[PDB]
Paper text:
pmcAquaporins (AQPs) are integral membrane proteins facilitating the flux of water (orthodox AQPs) and/or small neutral solutes such as glycerol, arsenite, and urea (aquaglyceroporins) across the lipid bilayer of cells. The human genome encodes four aquaglyceroporins AQP3, AQP7, AQP9, and AQP10 and recently AQP7 was identified as a novel regulator of breast cancer. The model shows the typical AQP fold with six transmembrane segments and two half helices located on loop B and loop E. Furthermore, the conserved aromatic/arginine selectivity filter (ar/R) and NPA-motifs (NAA and NPS in AQP7), characteristics of the AQP family, are clear in the model.
Here, we report the single-particle cryo-EM structure of human AQP7 at 3.2 Å overall resolution in complex with the specific AQP7 inhibitor Z433927330 (4). As seen for AQP7g, the AQP7 with inhibitor (hereafter called AQP7i) adopts an octameric configuration with individual glycerol channels forming two adhering tetramers, which interact via their extracellular C loops. An unambiguous inhibitor density is observed in the glycerol channel, showing an extended shape with the kinked end exposed to the intracellular side. The inhibitor fits into the glycerol channel of AQP7 by binding near the ar/R filter (composed of Phe74, Tyr223, and Arg229) and extends to the endofacial side of the pore. The ethyl-benzoate group is accommodated in the wider pore area in the vicinity of the NPA motifs (Asn94 and Asn226). Further toward the intracellular side of the pore, the ligand forms two hydrogen bonds via its urea NH groups to the carbonyl oxygens of His92 and Ala91, situated on loop B. Closest to the cytoplasmic side of the pore, the phenyl pyrazole group is accommodated, and the nitrogen of the pyrazole ring hydrogen bonds to the side chain of Gln183, which likely positively affects the specificity and affinity of the compound. In particular, two residues located at the intracellular vestibule of AQP7i, Arg106, and Phe187, display significant shifts in comparison with the AQP7g structure, resulting in a wider channel at the intracellular side to accommodate the inhibitor. The Phe187 side chain rotates approximately 90° to avoid steric clashes with the inhibitor and instead it forms a CH–π interaction between its phenyl ring and the carbon atom of the pyrazole ring of the inhibitor. Permeation analysis revealed no water permeation when the inhibitor was bound to AQP7.
Numbering used by the authors:
A (entry chain A), B (entry chain C), C (entry chain B), D (entry chain D), E (entry chain F), F (entry chain G), ...: 26 to 278
Write the structure that this text describes.
Amino acid sequence: QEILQRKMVREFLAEFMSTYVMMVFGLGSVAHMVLNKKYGSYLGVNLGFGFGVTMGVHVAGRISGAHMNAAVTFANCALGRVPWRKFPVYVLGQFLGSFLAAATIYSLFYTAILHFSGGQLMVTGPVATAGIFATYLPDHMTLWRGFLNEAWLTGMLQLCLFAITDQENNPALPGTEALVIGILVVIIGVSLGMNTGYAINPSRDLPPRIFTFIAGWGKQVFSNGENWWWVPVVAPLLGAYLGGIIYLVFIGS
Amino acid sequence: QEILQRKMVREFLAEFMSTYVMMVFGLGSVAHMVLNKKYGSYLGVNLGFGFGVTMGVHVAGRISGAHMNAAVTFANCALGRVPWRKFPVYVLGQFLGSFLAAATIYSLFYTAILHFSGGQLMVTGPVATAGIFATYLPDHMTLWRGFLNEAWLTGMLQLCLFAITDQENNPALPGTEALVIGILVVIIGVSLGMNTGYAINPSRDLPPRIFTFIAGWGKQVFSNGENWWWVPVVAPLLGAYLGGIIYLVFIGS
Amino acid sequence: QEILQRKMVREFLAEFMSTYVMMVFGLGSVAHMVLNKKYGSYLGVNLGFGFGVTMGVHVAGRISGAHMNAAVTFANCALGRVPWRKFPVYVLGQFLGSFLAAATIYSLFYTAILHFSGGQLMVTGPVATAGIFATYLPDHMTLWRGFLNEAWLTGMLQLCLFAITDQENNPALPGTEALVIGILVVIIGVSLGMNTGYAINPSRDLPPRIFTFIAGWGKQVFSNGENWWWVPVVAPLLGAYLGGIIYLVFIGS
Amino acid sequence: QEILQRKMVREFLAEFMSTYVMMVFGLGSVAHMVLNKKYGSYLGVNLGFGFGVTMGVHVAGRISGAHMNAAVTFANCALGRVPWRKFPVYVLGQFLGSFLAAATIYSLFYTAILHFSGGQLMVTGPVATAGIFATYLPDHMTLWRGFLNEAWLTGMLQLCLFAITDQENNPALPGTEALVIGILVVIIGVSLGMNTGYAINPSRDLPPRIFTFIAGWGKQVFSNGENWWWVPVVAPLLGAYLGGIIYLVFIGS
Amino acid sequence: QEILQRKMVREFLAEFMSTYVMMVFGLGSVAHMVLNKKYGSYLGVNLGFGFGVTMGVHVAGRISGAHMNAAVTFANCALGRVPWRKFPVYVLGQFLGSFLAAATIYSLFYTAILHFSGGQLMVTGPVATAGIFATYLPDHMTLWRGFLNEAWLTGMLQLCLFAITDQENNPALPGTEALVIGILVVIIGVSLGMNTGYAINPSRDLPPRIFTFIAGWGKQVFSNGENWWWVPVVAPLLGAYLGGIIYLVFIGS
Amino acid sequence: QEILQRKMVREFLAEFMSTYVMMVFGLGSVAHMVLNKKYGSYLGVNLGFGFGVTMGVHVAGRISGAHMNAAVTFANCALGRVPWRKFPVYVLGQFLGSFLAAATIYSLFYTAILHFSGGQLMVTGPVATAGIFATYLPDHMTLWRGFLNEAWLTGMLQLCLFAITDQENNPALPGTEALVIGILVVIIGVSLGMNTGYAINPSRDLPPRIFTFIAGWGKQVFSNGENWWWVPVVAPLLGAYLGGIIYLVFIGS
Amino acid sequence: QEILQRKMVREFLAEFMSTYVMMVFGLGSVAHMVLNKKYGSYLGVNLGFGFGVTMGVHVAGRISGAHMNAAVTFANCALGRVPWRKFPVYVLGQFLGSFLAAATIYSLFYTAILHFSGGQLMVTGPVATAGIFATYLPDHMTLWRGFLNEAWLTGMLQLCLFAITDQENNPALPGTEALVIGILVVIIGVSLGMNTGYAINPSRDLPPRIFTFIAGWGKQVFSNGENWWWVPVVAPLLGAYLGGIIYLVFIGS
Amino acid sequence: QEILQRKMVREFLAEFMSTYVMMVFGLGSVAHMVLNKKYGSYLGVNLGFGFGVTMGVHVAGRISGAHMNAAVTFANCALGRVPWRKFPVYVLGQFLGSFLAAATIYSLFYTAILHFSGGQLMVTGPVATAGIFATYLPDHMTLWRGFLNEAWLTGMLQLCLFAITDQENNPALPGTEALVIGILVVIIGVSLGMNTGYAINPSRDLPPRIFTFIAGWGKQVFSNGENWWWVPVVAPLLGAYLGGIIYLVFIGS
């Protein structure tokens, strides 16, 4: 038990658990929306994926701040708030948590997925089920506009997160920040979601895609949409950095 | 009035009242969803059954902690937080409250039930009404996968309820814990509900089934779904124990 | 301005304004649900009529407690919390506020009502519009069962209101009671609403009916449903008294 | 950086950013409702446009109070709370923020707008898209009744926003005012929205209309509905002034 | 084989076979309309029950004229066209054919009926299946108005049958009368069908009702609708007699 | 019985009966389409109103030719085929038959009309029932365009009826002309019907309107649609005359 | 060209062409019903099959009688009407015609099939397309009941075909038999079709199944439904023989 | 009037009138299907466009045979049945008739077209109206497959027309050929219509396209779908020639 005494292990485990819980809730809501129409709705996805973040923040608040997203960690490290030493640990914890959450969601809804798909797993089609785990580019939307959407959404998320938590300007009452963050995520999903699925998280996107690829959806997951997989990994970092810079320069003294 | 002075009677009455109120709200929402399509929706069931737990916590907060679920009481007693002496009292109070709540819900919606069913009470069918009181296994889902779903959902519920209330790590602001618990139950219902009805409560499941059996739905309530009735009584205990152990070992110092 | 200095006038004006605001919001939500199907839903009615109570409590909190319901005032006066001297003043304020709110709602949605009804105002029918202002008994539901439903709902409301506000047992955090009361009203509407429209308020029911009768819907508003109008005036008083007695005897020490 | 030290520049930038964020969220929700029916609903618009005001208040709370609406600023200046010197600065900041938010929303949803409209931009019609940015008068509703609706809604908004914030009577708990304000806006949209789109904000209305006019929707945006554009600029000022006067005279000592 | 040489036996067998075929087609169309909505429509029932008469006329044209209806036989016998000696033979043949056709239709659609009803056979209800074999009075329609409808429809049918076949006035081209009669029945069903199911045939109505009663639908088939069963047995006789009298007196020289 | 010997009385009775039967079938189909959506469709109206003409032609073929339409009689008289002496007799017979058919249709569907309308008879509205008997101008269509539509449709009907019956060019096989005429009316209704209801018959239009006016629909039947009632009385005469002239000049030698 | 002079070659070619045309029309109607919901309906399939049989009868009437079905040929040969020498020639012609018709239908609707199925050909599933060519047993219906349905339908078809064509009893007018046969097939499809797809033709069933098997739907076409493929090959022969025997013994002298 | 005596003028006028009537009926049915969904269906289009051909055949039967299609005329002239001298006259008559029919249909449905399109005429889009007059290639279907479909459909039409009319083999009863031809066209539309709109007529396709181009739909009518306009002008000629050759060689002695 001597390993668990170190603070690095604690900051790894807290991130792992919080990301796992949030991803489980989000993927469950998405599966409900996709598979069964009677029990699913877009507002259900928004509520689940917004108030799962709240539970993750509650779980891993003091230990590591509950980043739960690699773009937020990159933005914090670039601004000097968090040293670069802890970046790989947070990234590994988030990736492992998301991968295990995707595995759990696949395990729970196995029979429903088989019944809906008819036994054949298709990435794209009328009965496609690969969109539950990772986001895919719609038909009308293009690649670079998707890049713009991802970067812009991540920028707004980072600016709002800076505004809510900042103690100098107008912080939320302590102990109620999780509800405000959850409502922020909910309204982000409601208002700016249909264009690209509002990924704005490399941890939410890549590990589920890898899990589907090794589970059996095939190599079409990467090559679909003119190699769309790398956009959610690149755009959010720049978006979050720009949003933090804008907030700090303008409103943050 | 000398009987009411004893603390055991108080801890019995508080549990009885809180469980009664929560079960009344939940069963009313379920009946609204089942009977009338215009006035019912899945989100309505989630909201009612999540924010009735908030009222129950408010009613029976200080006296006994408002366990309102036999799985939570078993998990607390196994970890030494609550002595084993008070377990039967809590179980009896919860069972009586749930039974009376089911009776009240049956009394209120009698004419609507008769009109919808046409006068014949059927456990399974196009106009089945036995699913209002207790959960039943869907067609595609099997028994052991239902056991897994129940155990996993109860484990997640226990882990989240332990994280929210824990004073050392990151407790919610006192006086606002009921809202957070209600939102947790709402998102659990939204995200992980369609597989088995998210029973995760022996008190919510068994007494309504017994009430239907003695009211006249017949003995088909127990034998349906390869004797499904015992799964919600066994799985949540193990799920809650495992969730509490995991949280205590990893995150709770 | 010497009249406004007296406390009686202030406690009358506060009740008038709070009841007016709450009734305006509730009737607007009901009109949205009834007239236009695209912009209306049952959940919209529940949210509007639940969180209008919150705004009324905020407006008239300290001056008079924001009873906004004759049943609550009668229950408080019968238990000795409020002297009988202030009962007529509160009743008159609530009645005037509700009547003016009904008049305002009629004034705002005049063209939409005329377009939907085709120019003819009918109490009952496929294009009936008299149900916006007052509740009417459904076809399957009978008179005495409606009396039972009204009394039971008012009793549950009074018990929950006692539980939430009581300082000794487990009060909500001060400054956040309005949100909890609004959520309570929302879940009451969601869970126990389709049977009779969850009137549980003489002030919400009678003055709008009188306004419709003098506006031109005819005398059919009173005689419809075997003289249903007197049930919402009688049942809630007994329901609230019984709920308060039960809470005080069992849980409130 | 010497310019940013002055308080006037700070009060300009805070208003600009808060109005920009709120308008972005509101227009995104409206576009979701209009373009795609599966991902859009009226409740989504209400939630987005209500809880965007919460984030705006959080962003620009201490610096300038987050007026975010010219009617509120005019009402405050007329009552002497805010000097007339700061009115033009606030108005310019709000106008610029709203114009840039409309431009951003147009940039993000360009392909979806082209696909839905078929390539032709029409102010009025079965595939009209000019209603995303600015509100337009419905067919049954007339001009002066729209004026009445706008003034009345702004009056109720001002009275409630004067109640939730007043420290003497019954203020909300500090740090939680943003949630209550957001819920107020949500219920306003739910209850009193279908008549005219509940503009009640010159900044929310005029700059998007100007942006559409210069973007290419034509000059039909102004002349439509018997020159409806000037009503949202005139009615809210009188409505807010009357609401503030009523609250101050009656309930505010 | 000496029995089959007699003309009475031949005129009995022809009626039996023709009535059997027509009833089989009609009941099959009705079952398609009732059970499966995708494969059923009112126009399908009209076409089947109209062009089954054509096939029956083709089968039993020369031997006995293909009366296939006790009302037509009674009308012909009362006018002296057919002697009273052959009335019981025709009635017995029609009754036996209709009973066997109902038995065959019950045998073919057994599994579909069990699946649709859930295993319980109900005369009236949301999943009622007793209406496939015999007609039942709707909720809004009364007994004596049903008598009037039946008599009037039978009178119109008899007048049109007299007009089509009459050689003196304007007979249809020989060999094509069956198509015209089928189209007449189709348009009768289309134009005057929703009030009472356009029974206008004792042979089409009573034997299926008796078959359901002995098969297990219970004694509710006779007592339903204020003893509706005797109206289709009495009204068509008077209707057909009056129609024939009117045609002969006015148009038929 | 000496009166019935005269040929004038015979032709009068034949026209009366044929028009009565055709109008009964057409109005029954229209009532089915209007009142009940499950049992009604536009194709049902077309088939009923097309193959009722066939039955009328069969009934009154040799005696008078079964004009059943004042426009056809006027066109025949203007061309010298029929002397002007018999025009008033035919017109009176058609008018009386149509009036009695409207009365019969009103008598049969009385309860259904009362249930659908809620007890109030409205010429125009969401539950209007005056359109069953007579045609009314739609909202988008204007008066003179309706005149053009009526005249053009009557012209095409006259040209086709002249071509079908003409013995010199290419007559249909005798005894099958009724089916061809019915199919012609059906396709006219299918192809050119939604603009004005394809009245093209003064006898089909005016007497039902008069019957509704005296039955209680009020004087709004005449004044509706800028006095639309006179167009179906004037346009078909000119249309039929022009069609007959065109056919005779160009194709009929 | 000396080969074409022989009567055997002519009786082969006529059967080939008629079966080809009828199968093409039927499969086109089925594909329209299955693929596109807007352009497809069950009544369309019924009309296509019936009036394609009509066209086949017109094409191959005098040369060979247009059997177009192996059951009819077997029934005729067993009764001595057709010698056994011509049975193999007719069977081969029908099989070749049906196979080529299936190939043509596959060639025409290739892109639509690929678009609907998403590129994957599945025998059973939500996007199954193997049912266009051959009939498959529904879920509720069993094997032996399907055998009974097929035999009974073929018996009724044979009895009606004997009745229509028989010159002694009541033949249809020569030159109009094709319309009557088409209407018979249409009403058979309307009344007795949903149970098993009313195959009642080995030539209509087996060759399309073989074509799908060699085209790429796999070997699941034969093994599906407990080896359902042999029922349409065996049942119709017995059904047709029994129907012919019954008609000849009872009605056919 | 000396011009009308010549047989060439008669063969021009008969073709003109018959084509005009058939095109009017077909375009009216198509407009009903496209504009109003309540009054339009695919089966309506099939019935109208099939039984308009019947009326055209009746009108112009003896004078010129009622070719009404340039493909049929070319096929007849190539086989020597009709001399090449009369080909240009028939083509000109058909073209003029179709152009005037398109003009008439545009004149009748002007207000409905403007209301549906919103005032803007678009060839392709959600509110496109250019498809009423001429057929356009669907999205999934390609150019050469459309050529194949057109040629194949015209071939089947020509083969069936040869079979129906041929006196030696099995002609339809004289005077009833029009009904059989109409049913043939109806089933062609039902079975093989959704791929390309079953143009199979240059006269039905090109003149309406030219009329739309000069009326104001723009030059996009020709360039749409990779210059689709020339396929309906080329494919039907080859299809009809091949069908006639096949019928003459194989079945026609």
